[model samples]
Target: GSSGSSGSAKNAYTKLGTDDNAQLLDIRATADFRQVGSPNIKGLGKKAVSTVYNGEDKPGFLKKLSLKFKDPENTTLYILDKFDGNSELVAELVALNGFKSAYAIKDGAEGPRGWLNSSLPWIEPKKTSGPSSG
Candidate 1:
């Protein structure tokens, strides 16, 4: 196995259905999700999971991952971030945790080659009635 195979968002998007264990993980921070929303890869009744992976919450991210992807051997993990580098980092982490294979969505949500930029289907951030933050 390899831990750093990479490709464009379009490439990954098209290959979403090639495997049964496929799972998409959007590893961008929560703020980014609220800022511009995320991709809606509607395949096999599965959607992307918003798991934060930044400078401060590596363990938290992994914990959330373990709960959903316990069988690494059977899990075909796909990841995307605001840009592409972060996704690549998380892919490596997934591989380190024993996943059979991990694919990073290069470009990403708003990057030059990301899903939104590539004209892929995506949902805008949900509308809220009021600004409720401290």
Candidate 2:
């Protein structure tokens, strides 16, 4: 339960929300996303963010990151996660891969709960589907 000292967080909701090039990664626990529902902040999609990197395994972590972000050097990532630490850690990983920029939504130290208060558009309670969840 670390606090404060985020890498590069942004309170720029409107801007980031619309930044076409900046990929908004909505990281939520799979259970939470299925149970209480998670924010679908206009442009971003849901992806399990339980682990971006373990730090102890650089090659393993970076490999996973590369799979997710093929062109890390050219992309800008905006993380929306359950905590600033989650995003901070991810930002570091993204930067390590030579990403142009990495940003965590400010006050996102417990997911995007704040988005609910920001008047930003969000989706309804998402549910899991059978066969193909897509």
Candidate 3:
């Protein structure tokens, strides 16, 4: 399987905090993001970018990704979801599409060893035009 690699939640947080070119992509469901909340990426001085890719509308997701991220070769992409599983799917897609390095957070956003569990920053979901895209 020519899938993408994985990293820990802390690792994702650390990389995104330091790397200017490193980007976080939350591929979780919008409803889940609201029900469970999301990582507080604004504290890192970065905008939150999220989208869903549950095997449906994959082409649309890819198109949106293409428009948002141009230099896949140089960009480091970190994908997250409710759990580790779905993130890997998106990671694989990005890998196949030519992202030199895309990582799925193995612990996920709310996994046992995940972002919230790791005691990283988080925020309650709000009703504003949240995150990056609709």
- Ranked by TM-score, the better of candidates 2 and 3 is 3
lDDT of 2 by residue, 1-134 (tens): 33533433335355454564456555545554555455555454433233333456767755545566656676667666655445566656677667777766655534454555556555546445663543
Q: Which stretches of candidate 2 lie over 4 Å from their true place?
A: 1-12, 42-64, 109-113, 126-134
lDDT of 3 by residue, 10-98 (tens): 87888877877778888878887767776788877776577776676777777768767758777778888787657777776787787
Q: Write down the lDDT of every candidate, Cα atoms only.
A: 0.75, 0.54, 0.75
Clashes of each: 0, 1, 0
Give the better candidate number (2 or 3) by lDDT: 3
The weakest ten consecutive residues by lDDT in model 2 span 44-53
lDDT of 3 at 47: 60
Candidate 3 yields a Cα-based lDDT of 0.75
Q: Global CA lDDT of candidate 1, please? A: 0.75
The Cα error of candidate 3 at residue 70, in Å, is: 4.9
Report per-prediction Cα RMSD to one decimal: 4.5, 6.6, 5.9
Candidate 1 structure quality by residue, lDDT tens digits, 63-119: 887777657776788888888657777777787776777788777778887888786
**Candidate with the greatest TM-score versus the true structure:** 1
Q: Point out the higher-scoring one by TM-score: 1 or 2.
A: 1
